[model samples]
Target chain A: GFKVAILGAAGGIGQPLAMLMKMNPLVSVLHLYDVVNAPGVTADISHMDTGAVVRGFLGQQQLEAALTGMDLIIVPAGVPRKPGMTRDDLFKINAGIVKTLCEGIAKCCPRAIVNLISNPVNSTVPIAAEVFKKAGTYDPKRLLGVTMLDVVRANTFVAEVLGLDPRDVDVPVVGGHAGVTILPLLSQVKPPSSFTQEEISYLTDRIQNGGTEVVEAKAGAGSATLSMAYAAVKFADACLRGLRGDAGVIECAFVSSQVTELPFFASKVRLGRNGIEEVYSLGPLNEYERIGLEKAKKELAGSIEKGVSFIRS
Target chain B: GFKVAILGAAGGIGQPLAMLMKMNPLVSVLHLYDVVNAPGVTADISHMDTGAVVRGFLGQQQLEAALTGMDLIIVPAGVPRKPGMTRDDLFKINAGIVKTLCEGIAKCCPRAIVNLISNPVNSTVPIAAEVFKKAGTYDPKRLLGVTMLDVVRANTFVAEVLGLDPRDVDVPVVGGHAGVTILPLLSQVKPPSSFTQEEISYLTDRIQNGGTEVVEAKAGAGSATLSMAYAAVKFADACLRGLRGDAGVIECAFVSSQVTELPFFASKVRLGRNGIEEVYSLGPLNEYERIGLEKAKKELAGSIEKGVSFIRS
Candidate 1:
């Protein structure tokens, strides 16, 4: 019964993401807001007979109309990370965009859970937090930079390596959304299995740079729009379930506070009526994973610090 | 660059389509055949895509190797329409179980475009189009039914109604997949026009019964499928233009065609290298269309005949 608004609803991610959100049974009204073609996209998606009613809001002029009564705001609105760029490189461009949109969310519907699918999560997320802080609307639980994709990707790749169904293989990926910053609890992989150090390194590298692989494979045609769009939808589904007060809404995301030494980290978070009902601890780690964690923390901290600095300036 | 097949690829209207056939840009190899799945559909679509490789055949048993050579196989498989019931009703059984194992399309290579979207299209489309029609494969176009989705919907709707932006007015719709004989075209509209006595009745009935109007909506959904799928992919910029050649190859569909016709129906004819080239015809029908020719036909003809013929006889 909640209204969901998508910013930059006409971009590569926005179009497909909007369509997927429209199909989600939980979305009652979907508001698509963007600088251009939002109305056209909205009109197209609205035709889908899924239960939700869709409305497209074009331009900055209509942003509020799209956000006004929304229960959740999923922002996939930003430039994507390309092959050669670091997540931080992405931060420089997306940070400005995220800040502007979050400001709108703070103004129109501050209480809505904000799921950010923008890149340089370590930074754009902080940018969102600062905007909310400035607006006096910061609710740590309500703002999340999506990192569910990492977990989803890790689960699939690990599943492939272990020859198990990806869906059945649940790998809890924690830490940040970049290089070493991305930590996958290989030790905690379900259907417990062992990997050679070589395998571990290969899997770890694959997971850490999944976005880049996709970017390069696509050869500049577009970033991981489809995969990211799919992951964003998966994350949104969990968030909706949480919103519905469903029990065990567990998904990993980059959120604020202390499940670790850092202010924010990607970990398995139990979601519910209140976003981030509980941020679970990373139960255990192996020597391999332990080293991975330390390395990840160092990289993540930089990304996090970079995000916070953007808002400061 | 790869050979693509469409089981049931050739039939009532597969030939004479696709102008840039051999030079499709996306197809390098083309196969066409059909006993049940590939033959006809293949014949019809093989010449399309321009680059990759295209080959189609009929019947599931032959499906294996027919699929052995290439990348994608679009399945419009199963009986077309006889019409009395909605596409959902039509697909009630045939559409339900017909091509279940095409999953080879998926199993052989999960990356293939198993355009399994079939009819009783509403339920059948999602039923298992991709699984067999689309098991491992999951390209939006792979598992989609061709509706060109009322390409004519926008065209005629725009042309018939005075002073309206057909391009601007998009009528979002939902329901079971038999697009040809489905539910209301709810959502949004533009160029803001209304149907007067004859106008409203004519357009509404025509649009609604467009498919059966063609199955008896063209006398059935078969011929519709080839063109429908053709237009569907045409809309699929990724399928034709982007991933392969041109910049835009746009076409629409009953994709999940069940969105309207329960099984769904056909509408406009759009062809673009990627973005849905050009949506054509469906010009303007007058008062007579009100109580008239626009009404669903072949329902008894398309669905009933095919259903009873396929199942009963």
Candidate 2:
């Protein structure tokens, strides 16, 4: 059993995320924090007949209490993406939210593993790292920028093309969280398969634009809360399992890494009690994936710099 | 894999409920039908890398598509309770919604096991039964009214008092889903225990008022969507496991029964390949529980009559 905290535990993503976490067998203590509606979400999730103990921390004043003694903290605290908006468009606002939360984590429970779900994750993970460093408590392995949604979409979309179960298909999505920067290595798809040139193009485009597909379908209301929460919980559960000293725990995540030329990249990382225990290299890629990787790197460089500079300024 | 449909699949409860169900291994197909935002929720949930094939059916024209070929149906389609409102207060509006959805279920997928989560379950379950009867598709074993929330609350509240994990406690909540009508059998609590008259009174009142506590805590936004979704998922999973022919699956559900003088009562039931194989009798009750049963039946009789008559007239 682990002590976990959900920042922004009252919003669309946070509410379900909180509920799912409440039901997780690994969580013994769950601190739900939000500027508004935290009490309501907390009261609702607290009724579940699970082992997790739930508490609500409303507003900034209660933030420290929510972080102290937490083994894991998941940040989903930011505005949503509306119609015709890219994750980068949400940068200015979400960056600050992630920074403040990371600072609280740095002071209250610096050893806690942090999973960042705030938008523009490409930048926010770096912003979180900067905040931790300024407070003299930076640990690259402990901060994860959740890119599981991209991998989730990749597996589903690829399965749709290949006529397979998404669970049986393992698609390693690398690079970053936004549009062109999201790289799905079609050549490296597990079950050992190959695709035509058009198949590769179609799969890559759909995986890269999966968020927009949901945003357009949402029609100006919101973007990707349910799927994002599922992805976050999947990653969070992996983190918890790793903390529990489970072996062979591996998943693709955006973290401060040396997997590529970029300081931050989304690649396969093995998890253990100390957080990201090892970063895996991008496996063999075909020519199409090689082109895709370059495009991902170019955009990721810009997003990573934006987030890193946000905390500095 | 089981095919399942959620009638109001886009609302607060429906959205999260749909997400959780989408992740269930037994569900091969999921049809999410809602008058509004069905496509949004469907598209959002469809992206998850699970085996379930997801579809969105919007409005009356597409209702049949959603219900056809479904192995199970869960209705969470009606409006939510606001601050200061009782579950019975939501009867007129939600009953009509449940009736319409149940009528659709009667016509399509008539043999599907239905888990009704529309408010005023005491009445709505009866309403659904009547609709199925009129259509000549009624099966007492297949219909269940969700009262697991009460049982869930009882476990949590009692665990709080007893200083144990809620998962380790089993409090059978019976009778119905409203104030006075809801009954938590303290004497028969598994991990068997007894309580002071004062403790019994306090626990019973709190269990009955659990919905209200969430309503007030929500401060007029919504009521118990997350917890209700969690409970609904738990019950639905039990139903699935029962359908899978798992032995000794038991849960408390509001259903048509001969367990009491009332036509419908919440009680412990064993689930098997058939929906409900056996409904358990209320075990020994202390003097306090005897009085509580009468109060529950008096109100449940009226609500059941209201639903039965509404369908007739």
Candidate 3:
């Protein structure tokens, strides 16, 4: 069991995410921090009959305390996208929020594994790397941009098409977290099944545009908070399993990797006691997957550049 | 595996509860129904890589379809309590909602085990019973009012005081759901521990007013959505386990009983293939517990009457 912290624990995603983490058997202590409403969420979650002891920290004054002594920290902070927002607009708001939190992480809990759930994750993850680098505490293995939701989405979409259990279907979503860059490798689906080209194309498009589907459906109430929290907990559980030295903890995440020319890309990584012990290469791409891979890389390059430029400037 | 339908599956508690149920291996098919936003929640939850096949049904027109061929139905479809609202005020709105859904359950899926979560559960549950009876489909064992949140809260609070794991502390919260009627039998706490008079009183008050504390903390935002969802899922899982004919499945729930003078009360029940196989007695009580039990039963009598009268008149 380890100590965990949830930054922005008051917001829609943060509140549910904190509850899920509190219920996790792997968490012994949970620290919830936010600019506002942390105390309320913390108090609510603490009443759950789980093993975790919960504490609340509000505003910038307690951010350091929230980060301190954490074995894992998950950030779901920043303004969520509303009815209509440009990609650049979403990036600018979430980037600043991510930068401030990463600076705190570098200062207070340099060794803690950090998972960034803030949007434009392709850029924010790079921004976090740059901050850690400047502080001379950079460790590629310790930072992850959560792209588990893409993999989660892909598994379900493909499962429906094949009439198989979603948990039994493993579809590796590689590349980045946004549209075009979000590529689902349908050809490599588990249980070893073949798909028509039409099925492949439909799944690929659906996986790519999954975020928009939720945002539109919400109609301005909020965007995918429950599902995102579920996905975040799923990924965080894997990270904890890796930290506990459980064997063969493989999951897809966007991190600093050598699998592609882009500095950061989402792919399968084998996790261990020392964070990422091995980054697995994508193997055996069919014609559709190969074409999708090219499109993914082209878009990922720009997102990676934007993140690097944000930090350098 | 069982088929389950979540009424009002697009609401705050409904969405997360649906997500948790989707992840439940006991469920084979999940039907999500809401007057509004059901499609969005269904689509969102459907994207999870879980064992359950998820479907969404929107509005009254689709209610029967949602309830058809279900092994269990969880109703959380009602407006939440706002600041400065009376219990009766909460009951009035939720009663009508529960009535409409119960009518559907009676018509389309008369044999499904019903777990009513619409609030003023003491009253709403009876209203459901009356509705089922009117349709000649009443089964005292099948209709359950979820008081699992009370048990979850009691276990957590007592664990905090005892400096022990909550999962290890089995505190049976027996009575009804709400205010004075919500009773925690501190004397019968698991691990065979005793509490001081001061500790006993404090724990009792905390567990009874747990919902109020969250309502006040939220300050008009909402009340106990996540924790309630967690408790609902925990109880629902136990119900499913029992349905599978797993022996010795015991949990605290509000149901028609002979355990107390009140026609419907919450207590420890042995769930089996036919819903509740046995209702356990309250066992022994200390001086403090004896006094609390009387208070709980006194208040429960009035609420039960209110529900019975609402339906009869």
Candidate 4:
């Protein structure tokens, strides 16, 4: 069992994420931190008959306390997207949040495995890298941008098309977390299935816009907090399993990678005791997937540059 | 895999409850019905890479479709209590909600195993019984008021005192689901432990007011939704296990019983393939437990009568 901290544990996503983490057998200690209502969520989940001992930390004053002595830290902080908002629009507000929280991690628990679930993960992940590098605690292998939601959606949407159970399907979603950069390698989906050209477009488009589907359905009440929490926990569990000395723990996540010309990309990576063990290359692609990859790289390159420049400026 | 429906699947408890239900391995079909935001919750959870086929039903127009063919149904539907409100304050609003949903259960799937989580459960469970009876579908064995939170809290609190794992500690909580009506048999706690009188008083009061603790911690935002959801899923899992023809599956729940003077009581009941197999008797009580039982029955009687009267009048 690991000591885990949820840096924004009182938001739309954080509340459920906190409960799920508390319910995790791999977690022995959980610290929930937020600017507001962390105590409420903390108190609510603390009553659960689970092994994790839960505590709440409020505001910047308690940030260090939440981060200290943690084995893993998951960030679902920052404002959510409203109607008519894009992931890029969430960048300004969530970027600074990522910066400040990463700085705290650098000072308090520099070696802790970090999973960032904030919006614009394509950019927020880079913000963390710069923050750590400046603080002289940068560990590329230890930081991750949570893109598990894209893979979760791809598996589900493709399963619907294939008439198979989602759990039985595995679609490798690479590139980045948003829009054009969110590419799914449907040609390589598990079970070795084939798809029509029309099916390919439908699956790829739906996977990219899955977040928007929930957001529009929400009618501005909120975004996809519940599903996001589920995916984040799945990613964290795999990380913890790796930390537990388990073998063959692999998942797709956005990280500082050399897989592409972009400084960062999301792809299959093996998790080891410390953090990222091996970064897997994007396997063979069909003509459509090959074209999709170029589009993903073009937008992803810009997002990475924006994040790196934010800290420098 | 059983067909399951969650009535009020858009409320605080219902949203997380819906997600967890979707993730359940035994659940093959999931229907999420609510007066509001059901689409959002349904859209959010359907993306999970789980076996359950998710659908949303909104308003009374679609209620029957949601309830149809469900093998089990869970109700976490109702308005939450705010500060300065008693459980009785929720009766007028929630009692009607329970009656209406129960009626749908009767008409659409009369034999479905129902887990009523609406509060005051002491009253709402009775309201459900009366509704089902009037509809000629009342099955005492099939209807249960979810009081698993009490048992969950008892195991957790007692484990803290004994310095043991809550999962390993088994505490049988009986009586009812609220305030004075809630009873934890401290004398009969597993592992045969002893507690000082002061410790007994402290644990009893805390367990009784556990909902209030989270409500106050929330400071007017909401009540115990996350913890409530966790407890609901745990109870549902036990019920599902019983339905799978597993032997000796026992959990405490509020059901019609002859074990006590009250028309309904929460105690350990063995679950069979149909629903409840047998209601276990409370063993001999110590002096302290004997006195506690009387107080619980006194308050529980009025709540049960109030629910029956609501249906009668």
Candidate 5:
């Protein structure tokens, strides 16, 4: 069992994410922090008969206490994307939020693995890395940008196309976590299934636009909260298992990588006691996937540069 | 795998409840129905990589279709309790919601096990029974009022007091699912530990007012949606396991019983393929618990009578 902190534990994703983490048997102590309502969420989740002991930290003053002595920190804080808004438009507000929280994490629990779920993760991960570097606690292995939602969508879409169980279907989505930058390598899917050209195009389009699908469907109420919470917990559980020294724990995440020419990219990562133990290259790609990968990289590199500039300026 | 329907899938509890059911490997098909945002919730949940195939039904026109072939139905559909409002105040609105939904269940899928999470549950559950009885689809064994939250709160509170893991302690909360009527048999708590008189009083009062604790803490933002959703899924999972013919499935729920002179009460019941295979009585109680039991019965009987009258009139 290890200590975990949810930085924005009272927001749309943070509330359910905190509840799910509190339910995790591998979590020994959970610290829930937010600008407001942190105490309410903390009090609510503490009533569950789970093994995790829960505490609340509120406001900027308590942020250090929330992040201190934690093995994992998950950030789902920030204003969500609305129907007309692009992920970049969200970056203006969320980027600042991520910078402050990352600064807290760097100072308080520099060794904890930071899982960034704030939007425009394509850029926010870079912002976090910059903050860590300035604080002299930078460890590329310990910082992750959560892009697991793309992988989750790809698995479900591909499973539907094949009439198989989603759990049995493994889809490796790489490149980034946004619209055109999101890449689903359907050809490399586990079970080695073949798909028609139409199926390939349809699956790729669906996975890339999956976030917008929920945004439009919600039509102003909120954006992808429950599903985001589900995907975040799926990735965080892998991190916790890896922290427990479990072998063979692997998942897709956006991290500082050498797999591609870009400073950061989303790829398959093997997680262990010290976070990312290995980053795997996109093993094999069909002709269609190769073309899609080019498109993804073009968009990803620009987003990464924008993030670095925000901190350097 | 089972087909399940969530009646108020767009509401506070319904959204999270649907997401959790979608994650359950036992649920094959999920029907999300609501008078408002069913399509949005359904679209969001269907994106998850979990095995459940999700569909949406909107408005009263689609209610029957949603319930038609479901093997299990969960109802968290109703206006939530507000801070200044008594549970009885919620009855006027929730009672009608329960009645209409029960009518649909009877006409569509009479055999589905119904797990009611709508509040003033002590009364709403009896309302469901009467509705089913009028349709000649009444099966006492298949209808349950979810009181698992009370038990969950009791277990967590007791564990905190004793400095033990919550998972290692089991507290049976019975009688009804509302204020004054919720009876927590702390004397019978598992791992069998003794409590001081002060401890027993504090624990009992805490368990009974757990709902209010969350309501006040939320400060009018909402009422116990997260924890209630968690408890509902726990009960729903147990119901699915029971349908799968899994042995030794047991939980405390409000069901038709002879455990007391009242027509319905919450107590430990064994769940199996037939639903409520055996209903167990409250074994024994200490002097304090015996007095508390008498007070609970008097209040619970009145609520049950109110429900029966709602249908009869």
Candidate 6:
């Protein structure tokens, strides 16, 4: 069991994410921090008998207390995107939020693997990197932007299209977590299945707009709270298994990478005791994937720039 | 909104309890039944949802078809308890194996509420309530045993102890979910005050043994599960008033109900629109009340009948 801290532990994502984490047998201590409702969420989650000793840090005042000595810090904080908004649309507000959070992470848990689930991952991750750079505590391998959801969605949709099980289907989606910036390499699906060009188009569009679909579905009631929570925890669990020295802990996430020209992209990375011990390239891309990659990179580069400038400013 | 169903919708308590029903905002239809997972619980709850539809029924096989119509179903099926369990231990186990999970409960739902957080109020609630009940449909609530983990405990305990915050004082507890049951009573309760011998004795023991107190405590977990699920759904905000209910519908549970009692138990009841109804009634008890109630219940009677029976038979 390891200690995990949730930066926005009281928000929509945090509440459900915390619930899932509390149920995880691997989490021993759960630290919850948020601008509001931290104490309440803490009180609520602390009751689950999953062996996790839970504590709450309200507002920025208790930020360090929440982060100090944690093995993993999940940031799902910041504002969500609107319908027409891109992951980049979230940058203006989220970048600043990530900056503040990264500052705390730098001071309190420089060694903890950082799983960033905040939007505009292309940029937010760099902002985090810059913060870590300022603190001279950057461990490039340890910081990650959770893009597993896109991969999960692709696996699920593709499985449905191919009439196969999602777990059995492995779709390596590379690039970054953004509109066209997101790329799913369907050519090398495990238990390989065939997809029509139209099917691929449908699958890719759904994956990219998954967030928008949810936002529209809720009519802005809220972003993908439950789904985001699920995705975040799935990544954290993989991170944990890696930390536990589990072999073959591979997942798709946007991390500092040479996987693409953007320097940060979501690709298949082998997780180990030291976090992203190995970041793999996109191997090979098909016509569709090759085309998708360029689009994904262009938008991701914009996102990454937005994030970088926020910190520099 | 989607459709949902509940079995064991009628019984000693299903009447008053079902009245509190409603289709989830996330649900378009609500079905209720007993012996069946729906039409029963649904019949009662359907009317409550201004937006969704509801249906009700009785028996098992129909559960298959009933399930054809649900998003969630809360079952309070089975017999209530006799004094033997000392209340808290009621419904400790309705049988060696809990059966008749409403063929529809499994067939139709396998993915519905089927919330069985019933008791033995611990064992039977979990034993094959789902696996034996069906082939595959599963809603996490399908066979969950609702162990009033003490949302009810704190409410009554606090009101009785110092009368500070029942709705306000939230206790997150862990361990085996029954008598000796579990530990957390928020040891040093707030709005600090001391208990009289009877108050301390009765409150402590009563709250601790609240479930058996419900089994013998209501003489049944069947009865408790309804209230427990009622409280759970209430707390989960799946009910009409769940999010806006009066103020005090807090109830703890031993999901799997395998926590403390071989089955489980329900603690004090909270009432709120969020479905809890409103948390009222924490009255101060004395030392005698504490110790007396603590030790006085006939061990033969207070001792878990189901666990004993499981071992004996």
Model 2 segments more than 4 A misplaced: A82-90, B82-89
- Report RMSD (Å) for each prediction in the order shown: 15.2, 1.7, 1.6, 1.4, 1.4, 14.7
lDDT of 5 by residue, A1-313 (tens): 9999998999888987888898899999999999999887887888889999999998999998888899999999898655556556567889999999999999999999999998789999999999999999999999999999899899999999999898898999999999879999887899889999999999999999998788678776667888899999999999999999999999999999999898899999999999999999988888998999999999988989999889998
Give the lowest summed-lDDT range of ten residues in model 2 chain B.
Answer: B80-89
Once fitted onto the true fold, the runs of candidate 1 whose alpha carbons sit more than 4 angstroms away are A81-88, B1-66, B69-72, B75-145, B148-291, B294-313
User: Model 6 residue B217 lDDT?
Assistant: 23
Q: Which CAPRI tier for candidate 3?
A: medium
TM-score of the second chain of model 2 compared to its true counterpart: 0.97
* Model 6 regions lying over 4 Å from their true place: A81-89, B1-72, B75-145, B148-313
Q: Go through the candidates in order and give each one's DockQ.
A: 0.05, 0.90, 0.70, 0.89, 0.80, 0.05
List TM-score per model, in order: 0.60, 0.97, 0.97, 0.98, 0.98, 0.60
Model 4 lDDT per residue over A1-23, tens place = 89999988988899889989999
The digit string of per-residue lDDT tens for model 3 on B1-313 reads: 9999999998888987898898899999999999998877887787778888889999999999999999999988998666566666667778888989999999999999989998888888899999999999999989999999999999999998999999999998999999889989887789889788889889999999998788777675667888888999999999999999999999999999988788999999999887989999988888887888899999999888888878887
Clash count list over all predictions: 161, 0, 0, 0, 0, 142
Cα lDDT tens digits for candidate 4, B252-281 = 999999889888999999998999999998
lDDT of 2 by residue, A1-313 (tens): 9999999999889998998899899999999999999999999998998999999999889999999999999989998666455556566778878878888999999999999998788888889999999999999999998999999999999999999999999998999999999999888889899798899999999999998898789876778889999999999999999999999999999998888899999999999999999999997877888888898899899988988898888
lDDT of each: 0.61, 0.91, 0.89, 0.92, 0.91, 0.62
State how far residue A138 of model 4 sits from its true place (Å).
0.5
Off by over 4 Å in 3: A84-88
Tens digit of lDDT per residue, candidate 1, span A1-313? 7778888877766766776786688887888888776656665554443556677787777888889988889898887545455445666678888988998999999999999988778888988998899999999999898887787668767876786656568888888888888999998888889988887888999889876665554454345554465577778888889999999889899999798889988888998997889988888998888888889888888888888888887
Model 3 lDDT per residue over A10-127, tens place: 8878977898999899999999999998877887888899988999998888999999999999999989776554455878888889999999999999999988999889889999
Clashing pairs in 3: none
Clashes of 3: 0
Share of native C-alpha contacts between chains A and B (below 8 angstroms) recovered by candidate 2: 0.93
Indicate whether candidate 1 or candidate 4 has the larger TM-score. Answer: 4
